[PDB]
Design a protein around this ligand. Structure first.
Ligand SMILES: CC(C)[C@@H](C)/C=C/[C@@H](C)[C@H]1CC[C@H]2C3=CC=C4C[C@@H](O)CC[C@]4(C)[C@H]3CC[C@]12C
Ligand SMILES: *[C@@H]1O[C@H](CO)[C@@H](O)[C@H](O)[C@H]1NC(C)=O
Length: 144
């Protein structure tokens, strides 16, 4: 994978990107229950990380999904509102420094077209300090 990248330990395709930029959160480990995610099935996400600065209301995530060279989805999300909506282990947004472990189950839709998808997410704080940068490639087998 590209420059300024480091693999994330665990059963996952994720890499940390922009590694030469200090990040307020370290993602130490990530594990996916069906290791290559499968369409139409549950996906269990387990993650171990560290928070070095309090993340406050107003943080946001830039998420980009790309299919080949096509910019499929590109938008920003309210970090706190998004975490609060998806019930990630009751984590209220004021995320204090410390040791975290997360377990979340999401559903991968079966209608997703087959292909090589690349995901990139950058989370920043309200004054725009880089929280973290993650990238990953997921190939869904061509049975449409
Ligand atoms: C952790 C990552 C690497 C794993 C889970 C893979 C990402 C999946 C879930 C991503 C890859 C492409 C994404 C994707 C492609 C196309 C569409 C159609 C659009 O109208 C709504 C979003 C939607 C439905 C999203 C849903 C989430 C998908 C299917
Ligand atoms: C998928 O997840 C839903 C809710 O998380 C659960 O009710 C269902 O039993 C799960 N099914 C499988 C096959 O894991």
């Amino acid at each position: 994978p590209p420059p300024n990248t480091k693999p994330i330990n665990g059963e996952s395709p994720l890499y940390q990107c922009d590694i030469l930029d200090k990040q307020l959160v370290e993602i130490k480990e990530v594990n996916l229950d069906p290791n290559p995610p499968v369409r139409g099935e549950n996906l269990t996400i387990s993650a171990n990380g560290e928070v070095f600065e309090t993340i406050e209301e107003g943080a946001y995530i830039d998420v980009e999904v790309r299919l080949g060279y096509i910019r499929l989805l590109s938008q920003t999300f309210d970090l706190c509102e998004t975490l609060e909506d998806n019930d990630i282990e009751g984590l209220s947004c004021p995320i204090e420094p410390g040791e975290y472990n997360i377990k979340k189950i999401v559903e991968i839709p079966g209608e997703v077209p087959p292909g090589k998808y690349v995901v990139v997410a950058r989370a920043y704080t309200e004054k725009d300090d880089l929280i973290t940068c993650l990238t990953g490639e997921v190939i869904f087998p061509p049975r449409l």
